[PDB]
Symmetry: C2
């Protein structure tokens, strides 16, 4: 009865230059009130994308958000060595704001 | 103009039964639009307090939030071993929402 965010995958390993794709299903429609964060190890989440597809100022072109309704996607189109992190989607349509369980990226 | 949140401390040690105290400062008045999260290792942040001081469903009474406008405080009255976590403030007055840098809590 709060909103449940279903993020996939739980983890992934990929090489530098790879296209990384992450999905978030929302348990009910949220319009596009969804944010994507990046949590570098030992740091706070940092907002990359809001409104499901809007890049924050000074966020690199390789990050993008697709979707609206209940299915959303996050892409890093070419993965850089500084992109090692856990990425989270999050709805802000209604309090409480709920996070997907996250996608932990490792680099080879 | 984005809002910057200064969270302190960055890490502490305290013992079972101790008062733990954490502060968040906002660069601008943000009214009471302040969330406290708990992030257990491996897991997403989970929202404890919103609107500066309202506790979410089944957040224990030892936790509390106070403050308004700029200076905010998160207190655990008597520390319990299930509070092993990193706690974050986040402002939600204005997009982009911004996180404090977090307080990682260890027990002796």
């Amino acid at each position: 009865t709060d909103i449940q965010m279903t993020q996939s995958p739980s983890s992934l390993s990929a090489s530098v230059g790879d296209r990384v794709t992450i999905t978030c299903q929302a348990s009910q429609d949220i319009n596009n009130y969804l944010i994507w964060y990046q949590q570098k190890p030992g740091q706070a989440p940092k907002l990359l994308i809001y409104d499901a597809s809007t890049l924050e100022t000074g966020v690199p072109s390789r990050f993008s958000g697709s979707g609206s309704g209940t299915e959303f996607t996050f892409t890093i189109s070419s993965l850089q060595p500084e992109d090692l992190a856990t990425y989270y989607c999050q709805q802000y349509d209604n309090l409480p704001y709920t996070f997907g369980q996250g996608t932990k990226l490792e680099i080879k």
